[PDB]
Amino acid sequence: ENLYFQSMRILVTGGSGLVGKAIQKVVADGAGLPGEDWVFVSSKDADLTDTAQTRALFEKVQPTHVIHLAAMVGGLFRNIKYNLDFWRKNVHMNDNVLHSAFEVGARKVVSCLSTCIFPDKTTYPIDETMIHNGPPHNSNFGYSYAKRMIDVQNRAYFQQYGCTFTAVIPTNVFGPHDNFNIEDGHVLPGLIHKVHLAKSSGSALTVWGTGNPRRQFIYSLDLAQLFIWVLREYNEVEPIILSVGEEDEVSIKEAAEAVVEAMDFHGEVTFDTTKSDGQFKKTASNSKLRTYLPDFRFTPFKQAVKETCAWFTDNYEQARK
Amino acid sequence: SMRILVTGGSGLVGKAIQKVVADGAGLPGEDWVFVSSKDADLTDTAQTRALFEKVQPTHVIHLAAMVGGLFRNIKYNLDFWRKNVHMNDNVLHSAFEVGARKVVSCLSTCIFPDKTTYPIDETMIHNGPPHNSNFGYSYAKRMIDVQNRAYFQQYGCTFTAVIPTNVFGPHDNFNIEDGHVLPGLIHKVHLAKSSGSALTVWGTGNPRRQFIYSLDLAQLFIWVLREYNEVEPIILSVGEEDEVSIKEAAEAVVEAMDFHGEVTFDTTKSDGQFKKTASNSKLRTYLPDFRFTPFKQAVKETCAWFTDNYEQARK
Ligand SMILES: NC(=O)c1ccc[n+]([C@@H]2O[C@H](COP(=O)([O-])OP(=O)(O)OC[C@H]3O[C@@H](n4cnc5c(N)ncnc54)[C@H](OP(=O)(O)O)[C@@H]3O)[C@@H](O)[C@H]2O)c1
Ligand SMILES: NC(=O)c1ccc[n+]([C@@H]2O[C@H](COP(=O)([O-])OP(=O)(O)OC[C@H]3O[C@@H](n4cnc5c(N)ncnc54)[C@H](OP(=O)(O)O)[C@@H]3O)[C@@H](O)[C@H]2O)c1
Ligand SMILES: C[C@@H]1O[C@H](OP(=O)(O)OP(=O)(O)OC[C@H]2O[C@@H](n3cnc4c(=O)[nH]c(N)nc43)[C@H](O)[C@@H]2O)[C@@H](O)[C@H](O)[C@@H]1O
Ligand SMILES: C[C@@H]1O[C@H](OP(=O)(O)OP(=O)(O)OC[C@H]2O[C@@H](n3cnc4c(=O)[nH]c(N)nc43)[C@H](O)[C@@H]2O)[C@@H](O)[C@H](O)[C@@H]1O
């Protein structure tokens, strides 16, 4: 074999989700170099809360590389309900996946964190350094902390065994193959489904909260292309933030409007201010990711919202809803 | 009618709790059950589930954990993380599903933010990363609080914890390499008395610590199971004025044991965290009149115990 460009058997967990289908999409699209064997799995292949199944899965595949996306995910409102299930299930899934990869002897693992998890009381903009610098917002602390403990387990495997187990930190993500369930899903898909039912019913659109909170949104495909570059080129253990820039941060109100424009909605737009705004602001820096890939161009927000609404609309029956 | 399960019953703190209930602090209608790892490896779900099935615990005091001095922690943060996380999830979940009235796990003053104001209190537990020497351990104990807060918020379970400072007592782990400062310094002075060696105290001898005699802890712990109904944990420590330096601690031991040799410091060895001064103000709003056992007196009783049970003692 080649000492300098070596065979890869790559295991992607949570491969059927929003982020997972994007990587499939780009890889099937021709970003997969020769001598790379990609295996994407879902919970059908093995329930990663379970140790026996995970280990068995990890024996059957013999991955050199891991992208660990499998996690119980949800919007603000789902997290509020089940902080204990977000805590127990994700920590089991992460401990099983990291430890299986370890004893299988995998060369590298990139787990997946979130801007969600940073300290509520904070200086802005946030960055990789500040990950454990105070408690997270109380709305989603179960999930937050389970992610924080990935960073923790990463450094321990690395400090004790020299494992190149690291992670990425995406902001709020959106795109095709999302969870469009309104109750349990994120703001952008939830508004999309909402705008779809509204157009169809003659109803108003009800945007939850005040509309003033601020968010950074990354398109699943933009994120997938960085994810691919990370697995290959990036070799620190300290995680890296994958986010659109500071200047590209937006209110919930403009997000709603963007969906609206795109789906040609012409009915009333109403805000339910009784509902929770959650965390107001988690503004995050990409200066690090910039020092690596200074000339990468993110797909403009409004464009990505067009492509995502068109995807939902022409895949409405197949989508998760 | 209480059926109390004490995990880690065979450890330093556990023996202490066993000494006091037996000594008489058991109240009628309390069925005290102490266990150790031969009863069940709490890192295994199946075993943990089965213990909690046979025993039917109205209450749980959860001392069980992988524990060590600075120098063991430094080496083994991946174990310290993983093993403790497993035990605690297993115990807290079993407890929940047997439906216990109350669990009292055990945190530490170790696990507080390195970068902090002093004195440290219950409020600050998650206000920054812990020190790097024991991050694994530390984080695993914090997550107990996270998990505690999760069970109480979703199902209302009265799951809390206590935050003791450095403990010491009879039945401690006197393994010098793996154990805490005091029992290691005790083991050292004894091997020195037999050998005619100098005593080498590791570090500069300047770090500051708060020591609490297990026997004191025992009682406070016992009180907690009974009377303490906050989910937020409670610091159980000697007062802020009773903090001792390692040189003073070394001296204390040398007096008790009547050691006449030379006392020496290997300044190349880690000092760990210089200071973790903790406030017991909360505990005093409950127990204003609880007198702590003077530190020298307590040191003598451990040196006395150790010397007199050298062979049975964990060395
Ligand atoms: N979406 C965001 O806004 C966002 C932002 C930052 C970070 N992230 C992180 O990115 C990762 C991917 O998120 P996503 O948005 O793609 O979530 P998603 O679309 O809901 O997909 C979750 C994936 O995890 C799998 N999964 C869930 N529970 C499992 C279990 N018990 N065993 C095995 N597989 C299981 C799912 O498989 P099934 O199809 O079988 O259910 C699915 O493939 C997560 O780690 C998340 O924390 C997401
Ligand atoms: N000592 C201190 O300075 C200090 C300070 C603050 C807080 N604490 C906390 O106080 C608690 C008690 O500590 P300690 O000083 O008494 O420790 P210790 O003397 O080493 O005793 C540890 C206990 O845990 C049990 N144990 C360990 N691993 C186990 C496993 N896999 N399954 C079942 N049982 C297991 C041991 O049983 P075996 O006898 O079978 O090994 C033993 O009974 C711990 O939670 C510790 O974190 C200690
Ligand atoms: C990245 C994600 O961030 C999550 O916080 P967060 O950004 O508020 O997650 P979202 O649920 O995407 O955002 C909720 C914000 O958008 C408003 N909002 C308006 N309309 C809707 C709607 O139709 N659906 C939803 N869901 N919100 C809506 C809501 O009031 C709140 O300010 C974390 O809790 C998760 O852990 C997750 O990882
Ligand atoms: C309460 C305990 O606190 C621990 O920190 P910590 O107080 O430094 O734990 P110890 O190991 O008790 O203390 C180590 C301190 O005592 C000095 N020292 C001097 N002589 C000795 C000796 O003979 N043995 C040891 N071990 N130290 C010695 C050492 O340089 C350092 O300043 C945490 O890492 C644990 O998690 C644990 O829970």
Topology pattern of chain A, helix = H, strand = E: EHEHEHHEHEEHEEEHEEHEHH
The name of the CATH architecture of the largest domain in chain A is: 3-Layer(aba) Sandwich
How many strand units of chain A? 12
CATH superfamily of the largest domain in chain A: NAD(P)-binding Rossmann-like Domain
Count up the helices of chain A.
10
Summarize the main sheet of chain A: 6 strands, parallel
Classify the oligomer: homodimer
Largest interface: A-B, 24 and 24 residues
Instruction: Calculate the terminal CA-CA distance of chain A, rounded to whole Å.
Output: 47 Å
Bound molecules: NADP nicotinamide-adenine-dinucleotide phosphate, guanosine-5'-diphosphate-beta-L-fucopyranose
Major beta sheet, strand line-up of chain A: 2-1-3-4-5-10
What is the CATH topology classification name of the largest domain in chain A? Rossmann fold
By helix and strand content of chain A, what is the structural category?
Answer: alpha/beta
Give the amount of beta strand of chain A, in percent: 5-15%
Q: Indicate the CATH class of the largest domain in chain A.
A: Alpha Beta
PDB class: oxidoreductase
Keywords: oxidoreductase, isomerase
Assembly: dimeric
Entry title: Crystal structure of human GDP-L-fucose synthase with bound NADP and product GDP-L-fucose
Describe the overall structure.
The structure is a homodimer. Chain A has 321 residues and is an alpha/beta fold. The first copy, chain A, has 2 domains: 1-174 and 216-245 and 283-299, NAD(P)-binding Rossmann-like Domain (Rossmann fold); 175-215 and 246-282 and 300-316, Alpha-Beta Complex (UDP-galactose 4-epimerase, domain 1), CATH 3.90.25. Helices cover 41% and strands 15% of the residues of chain A. Chain A has 10 helices and 12 strands. In chain A, the strands form 4 sheets. In chain A, strands 2-1-3-4-5-10 form a 6-stranded parallel β-sheet, with helices on both faces. In chain A, strands 6-9 form a two-stranded parallel sheet. Chain A has a two-stranded parallel sheet with strand order 7-12. In chain A, helix 4 (83-104) packs parallel to helix 5. Chain A is globular, with a radius of gyration of 19 Å. Chain A binds chain B through residues 82-84, 87-88, 91, 95, 99, 132-135, 141-142, 145, 149, 152-153, 155-157, 159-161, and chain B through 76-78, 81-82, 85, 89, 93, 126-129, 135-136, 139, 143, 146-147, 149-151, 153-155. One NADP nicotinamide-adenine-dinucleotide phosphate binds at residues 8-14, 36-38, 41-43, 63-67, 87, 106, 108, 164, 166-167, 173, 180 of chain B. The PDB classes it as oxidoreductase.
